[PDB]
Amino acid sequence: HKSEVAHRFKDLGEENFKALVLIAFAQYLQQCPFEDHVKLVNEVTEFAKTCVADESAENCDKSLHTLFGDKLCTVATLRETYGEMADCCAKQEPERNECFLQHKDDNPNLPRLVRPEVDVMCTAFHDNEETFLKKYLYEIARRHPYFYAPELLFFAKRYKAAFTECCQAADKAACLLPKLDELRDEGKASSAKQRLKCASLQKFGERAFKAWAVARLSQRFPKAEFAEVSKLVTDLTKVHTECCHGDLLECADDRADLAKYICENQDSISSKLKECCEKPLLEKSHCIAEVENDEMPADLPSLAADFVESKDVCKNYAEAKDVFLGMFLYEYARRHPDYSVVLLLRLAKTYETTLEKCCAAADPHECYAKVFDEFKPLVEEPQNLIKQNCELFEQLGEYKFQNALLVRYTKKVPQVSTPTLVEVSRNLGKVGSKCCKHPEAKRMPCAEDYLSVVLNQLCVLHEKTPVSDRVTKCCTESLVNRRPCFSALEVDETYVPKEFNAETFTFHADICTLSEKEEQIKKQTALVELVKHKPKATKEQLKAVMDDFAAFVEKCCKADDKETCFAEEGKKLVAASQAALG
Ligand SMILES: CN(C)c1cccc2c(S(=O)(=O)N[C@@H](CCC(=O)O)C(=O)O)cccc12
Numbered sequence: 062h063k064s065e066v067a068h069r070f071k072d073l074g075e076e077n078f079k080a081l082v083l084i085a086f087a088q089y090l091q092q093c094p095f096e097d098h099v100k101l102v103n104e105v106t107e108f109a110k111t112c113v114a115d116e117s118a119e120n121c122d123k124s125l126h127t128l129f130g131d132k133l134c135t136v137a138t139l140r141e142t143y144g145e146m147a148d149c150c151a152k153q154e155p156e157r158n159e160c161f162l163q164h165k166d167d168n169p170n171l172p173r174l175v176r177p178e179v180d181v182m183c184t185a186f187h188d189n190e191e192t193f194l195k196k197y198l199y200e201i202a203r204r205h206p207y208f209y210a211p212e213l214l215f216f217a218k219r220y221k222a223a224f225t226e227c228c229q230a231a232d233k234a235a236c237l238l239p240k241l242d243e244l245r246d247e248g249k250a251s252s253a254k255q256r257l258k259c260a261s262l263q264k265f266g267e268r269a270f271k272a273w274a275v276a277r278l279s280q281r282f283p284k285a286e287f288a289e290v291s292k293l294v295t296d297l298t299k300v301h302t303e304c305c306h307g308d309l310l311e312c313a314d315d316r317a318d319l320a321k322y323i324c325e326n327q328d329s330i331s332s333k334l335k336e337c338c339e340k341p342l343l344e345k346s347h348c349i350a351e352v353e354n355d356e357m358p359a360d361l362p363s364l365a366a367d368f369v370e371s372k373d374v375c376k377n378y379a380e381a382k383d384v385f386l387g388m389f390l391y392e393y394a395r396r397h398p399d400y401s402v403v404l405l406l407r408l409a410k411t412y413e414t415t416l417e418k419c420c421a422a423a424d425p426h427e428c429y430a431k432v433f434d435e436f437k438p439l440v441e442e443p444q445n446l447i448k449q450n451c452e453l454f455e456q457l458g459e460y461k462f463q464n465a466l467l468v469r470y471t472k473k474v475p476q477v478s479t480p481t482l483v484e485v486s487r488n489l490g491k492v493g494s495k496c497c498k499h500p501e502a503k504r505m506p507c508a509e510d511y512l513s514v515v516l517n518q519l520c521v522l523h524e525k526t527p528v529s530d531r532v533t534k535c536c537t538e539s540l541v542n543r544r545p546c547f548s549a550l551e552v553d554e555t556y557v558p559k560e561f562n563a564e565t566f567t568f569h570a571d572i573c574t575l576s577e578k579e580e581q582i583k584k585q586t587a588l589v590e591l592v593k594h595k596p597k598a599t600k601e602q603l604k605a606v607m608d609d610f611a612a613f614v615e616k617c618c619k620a621d622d623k624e625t626c627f628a629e630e631g632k633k634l635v636a637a638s639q640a641a642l643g
């Protein structure tokens with residue numbers, strides 16, 4: 062009301078409040094030490110209570126932006142530590158706030174955060190639970206200035222649970238380790254998706270984004286009217302735009318609003334929202350944004366009615382092209398929760414091309430009457446890839462399936478560095494085990510989501526070290542053409558084999574003491590190196606060496622004087638294998 066701080070405090074609660082203030086400050090003063098921030102939090106929090114007691118007390122009427130800005134400029138070593146950023150304090154709001162966003166280094170030069178030993182972590186945890194988690198919250202926040210604060214807080218709590226459960230466990234490590242890994246990946250995923258979306262909104266512009274939204278929102282809320290979906294798409298676009306700009310507050314307020322709105326009108330939006338709309342302010346958004354797709358209406362007409370048969374297609378279309386196409390998407394999206402958003406985009410795109418040609422011809426209806434037929438091969442491509450791939454994965458295991466992928470892509474883009482090929486293939490495989498476990502009706506949406514980050518990661522670390530033009534075409538192609546572009550890659554006939562290296566195929570017994578994740582990655586690296594040396598090798602040939610090798614390993618890791626073995630058979634293997642592969 063008359064005091065923003067007081068208000069947020071009352072809403073959030075002391076705990077959440079102090080956690081967010083901490084995260085907020087860690088995202089700007091990325092260089093200040095943890096103790097420094099904690100003091101700021103306390104000073105701000107104390108101030109907050111002052112205003113809760115008397116909404117009219119000093120400065121309590123100031124805006125969060127101003128309050129935050131002033132506290133920020135309070136840091137003495139500001140100009141010494143951040144230099145140019147200190148010049149932000151001369152400017153008045155909102156230039157001051159704006160000035161800060163511009164100096165929020167999206168990727169500082171901080172040391173990789175190392176994972177301590179389970180025991181040391183559990184003891185730290187148990188001894189001083191609060192500072193143990195805050196301290197790490199701080200470490201993550203400063204390294205990820207754009208990670209939406211509240212989501213970060215959401216993660217912290219999942220971590221807390223893991224430590225509370227696991228540190229009591231018999232085998233602490235067997236309980237904790239796996240959870241920490243599932244949280245990391247999930248965190249990397251949220252990070253990549255966020256930057257991805259913002260990146261998209263940047264290059265491709267609003268339209269394409271709204272297009273994406275209509276499709277996603279329709280699949281999720283098939284019972285809502287198109288007018289409700291357009292309303293939501295509009296607000297969601299403002300939200301992502303603002304949130305991408307990096308301003309936490311503005312971003313948060315838009316998010317709360319849209320959640321409030323959706324809840325009040327939840328009856329005309331989705332039935333699956335009850336649960337989500339009860340939750341606390343800080344958790345509404347998160348919940349809603351992930352809510353399962355609602356059951357789609359049973360009495361739903363054939364699309365062909367309003368989009369192929371009708372004699373007013375072009376009329377309705379010229380009247381408002383995008384609204385029409387949007388309606389197409391809305392209609393097609395909600396009848397297919399099983400389609401990937403991007404696949405729906407391809408149809409809509411295809412439909413649009415057709416209408417553009419057809420509506421400027423003798424008689425439209427004749428020209429576009431069989432367009433749905435143009436869809437068939439489009440829908441099928443992603444489906445046959447999924448079946449063909451999940452099948453292979455069912456036979457072979459995650460690991461063996463990854464090797465298949467390894468051989469397949471190395472042949473496609475031999476120029477790519479071996480360590481890059483190994484990672485991509487591994488991640489690709491994970492997507493394989495994570496999605497194939499799903500009923501065929503949810504597979505495609507699943508692949509889209511995991512595959513989207515993986516391909517982006519692939520593109521980013523190639524943007525940097527350009528190795529192939531073909532990978533660059535795919536990486537800079539339409540966001541809806543990206544995946545098919547890669548699927549279209551064919552064996553590289555131009556590639557010239559890599560001169561043989563003895564050092565690259567010699568193994569030591571240390572391959573026995575190494576952990577699974579390490580043995581595999583050590584074997585897989587040799588595999589990519591093998592293919593990069595003899596690309597003309599048939600699956601049979603390769604399957605031979607791999608079999609020979611596999612034994613070699615086990616065999617040499619189950620006999621005395623290991624080192625002797627690996628060097629003795631080593632000569633033999635390399636020798637025999639080289640001849641088999643001409
Ligand atoms: C849940 N989420 C906030 C996260 C938790 C733990 C680690 C996270 C990381 S991370 O550990 O820094 N992940 C590193 C790679 C792995 C490493 O070097 O340790 C990174 O890509 O930046 C990134 C993004 C989100 C994370």
Ligand SMILES: CN(C)c1cccc2c(S(=O)(=O)N[C@@H](CCC(=O)O)C(=O)O)cccc12
Pocket residue numbers: 254277278297300315316317319320345346347349350351
């Ligand atoms: C709570 N509300 C304000 C929302 C915030 C952010 C995303 C939202 C979405 S969404 O973008 O379609 N849901 C996203 C996941 C959430 C995210 O990445 O932010 C998706 O399926 O790709 C739907 C409804 C409400 C949303």
Ligand SMILES: CCCCCCCCCCCCCC(=O)O
Pocket residue numbers: 174175176177194197198201213216217218220241242245
């Ligand atoms: C997300 C905020 C909660 C902070 C608690 C993190 C505790 C785990 C410490 C290890 C993190 C390093 C990343 C990793 O390798 O797992």
Ligand SMILES: CCCCCCCCCCCCCC(=O)O
Pocket residue numbers: 265268269271272275291294383384386387390406409410413539540541
């Ligand atoms: C609410 C109306 C906004 C939706 C506009 C419909 C756009 C459909 C065209 C699909 C093109 C995808 C963009 C792209 O080429 O990347």
Ligand SMILES: CCCCCCCCCCCCCC(=O)O
Pocket residue numbers: 069081082085125128129211309310313314316317320342343344345346347
């Ligand atoms: C001066 C410090 C300001 C403290 C930061 C308060 C902003 C956090 C509000 C969180 C609201 C939840 C929004 C959402 O649902 O995403």
Ligand SMILES: CCCCCCCCCCCCCC(=O)O
Pocket residue numbers: 464566584585587588591606607608610611634635638639
């Ligand atoms: C021309 C020298 C070729 C000999 C080197 C063979 C090494 C290839 C990697 C084998 C890994 C197979 C995967 C596995 O069985 O786990």
